[PDB]
């Protein structure tokens, strides 16, 4: 597959892509205004919301959050190791962004006002599409036709552009968000598998039922302006398996089309 149409045909299901070449503003799109269940990709928006709170409350990132074992929800590989020690707010942000740790996101949402606070933060950065309705791990049900916990590829690309490359955050907080995204450890087979050698990547993956396979981030070529890329993918059967290679190929197609 070398077009989004061919990729969606080969893979089955529904593929959504928005990639923006920031040198020109040109976009390559597929189903870019359709809603998709964002799954863990929202953790980029959550990390930004926490960073914004750290501007109004200096020192917030260094505050130690403690929690009991009974706070832990499914898929918490980092937080389950730190009941004794606690984790700083910054460590929770890194854990939920780089590993998709579920409890880390819930602890951060408890600190800032719940799912509604993440949605309100999205509105504050110009995103009138994103909606976070549920806590981890319910928000990954990915039901067809369900508006809960959805965004569009175009909206998430626009939000990542202003957060990572624009000035939605001050420079120091922006640099911290970039480093969290750069250190993603669970996206090797997705966007990162589709970029040329020497390109730097920061991204956030997500996975859910209906074989939902997502990844959104920013790509830095060595000699060109960055590309913002949001890929969402979901399938017909509730039991479908995630398809990492669909994301890798969509990334290659997006880059080839913009090049």
């Amino acid at each position: 597959p070398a077009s989004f149409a061919a990729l969606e045909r080969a893979a089955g299901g529904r593929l959504g892509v928005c990639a923006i070449d920031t040198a020109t503003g040109r976009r390559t799109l597929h189903r870019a205004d359709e809603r998709f269940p964002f799954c863990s990709t929202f953790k980029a928006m959550l990390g930004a919301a926490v960073l914004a709170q750290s501007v109004a409350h200096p020192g917030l990132l260094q505050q130690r959050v403690t929690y009991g074992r009974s706070d832990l929800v499914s898929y918490s590989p980092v937080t389950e190791r730190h009941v004794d020690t606690g984790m700083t707010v910054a460590e929770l942000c890194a854990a939920t962004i780089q590993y998709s740790d579920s409890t880390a996101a819930n602890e951060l949402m408890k600190l800032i006002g719940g799912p509604a606070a993440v949605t309100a933060y999205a509105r504050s950065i110009g995103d009138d599409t994103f909606r976070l309705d549920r806590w981890e791990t319910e928000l990954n049900t990915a039901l067809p036709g369900d508006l809960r916990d959805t965004t569009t590829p175009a909206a998430m690309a626009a939000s990542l552009r202003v957060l990572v490359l624009g000035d939605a955050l001050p420079a120091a907080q922006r640099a911290q968000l970039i480093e969290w995204l750069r250190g993603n450890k669970v996206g090797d087979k997705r966007i990162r598998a589709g970029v040329p050698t020497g390109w730097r990547v920061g991204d956030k993956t997500g996975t859910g039922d209906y074989g939902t396979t997502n990844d959104a981030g920013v790509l830095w070529p060595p000699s060109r302006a960055p590309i913002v890329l949001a890929v969402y993918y979901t399938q017909t059967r509730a039991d479908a398996k995630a398809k990492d290679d669909v994301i890798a190929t969509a990334t290659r197609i997006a880059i080839a089309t913009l090049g």
Binding site: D128, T129, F130, R131, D133, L147
Partner: peptide, 12 residues
């Protein structure tokens, strides 16, 4: 449009 923003904000 104003309806698009309203849908994003509406209860399910």
């Amino acid at each position: 449009a104003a309806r698009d923003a309203a849908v994003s904000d509406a209860a399910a």
